[PDB]
Amino acid sequence: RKKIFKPEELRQALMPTLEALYRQDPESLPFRQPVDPQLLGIPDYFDIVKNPMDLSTIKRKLDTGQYQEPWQYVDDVWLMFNNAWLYNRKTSRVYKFCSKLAEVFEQEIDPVM
Numbered sequence: 510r511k512k513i514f515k516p517e518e519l520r521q522a523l524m525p526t527l528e529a530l531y532r533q534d535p536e537s538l539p540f541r542q543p544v545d546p547q548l549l550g551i552p553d554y555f556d557i558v559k560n561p562m563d564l565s566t567i568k569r570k571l572d573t574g575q576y577q578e579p580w581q582y583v584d585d586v587w588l589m590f591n592n593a594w595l596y597n598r599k600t601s602r603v604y605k606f607c608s609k610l611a612e613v614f615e616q617e618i619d620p621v622m
């Protein structure tokens with residue numbers, strides 16, 4: 510089950526699953542850029558989230574061939590969701606938006622896997 514992927518083959522296969530998340534409006538808006546705790550007024554963010562991830566970082570990694578294997582891309586998307594569920598309360602808009610993106614992703618990534 511070892512396989513060497515061509516970065517452009519990975520990119521073409523995975524990019525549509527990422528585009529599916531970006532297309533969610535307004536649910537993708539809090540996930541489009543890295544969390545800046547001071548500028549968002551959430552100074553405890555890095556006390557709780559030690560491995561931040563967002564759509565712009567995942568896109569940059571896809572675009573520069575930093576994923577060797579599909580599971581590495583999926584791990585970063587899952588990390589982004591896990592961070593938002595960890596930091597935010599179940600009652601919050603961001604937590605609910607995260608749950609929407611995770612549903613969309615589960616649909617998109619199944620066939621690709």
Ligand SMILES: COc1ccc(N2C(=O)CC[C@H]2c2nc(-c3ccc4onc(C)c4c3)cn2C[C@@H](C)N2CCOCC2)cc1Cl
Nearest residue numbers: 535538539540541542544549551592593596597602603606
């Ligand atoms: C359309 O939905 C929203 C619009 C604004 C906001 N925001 C606010 O109410 C305050 C600032 C802004 C905002 N919140 C967050 C926020 C906060 C906590 C988070 O935990 N995990 C994540 C991810 C996360 C994200 C981010 N933002 C700023 C977003 C909307 N920027 C706005 C500037 O352009 C890029 C996107 C949140 C949402 Cl759910």
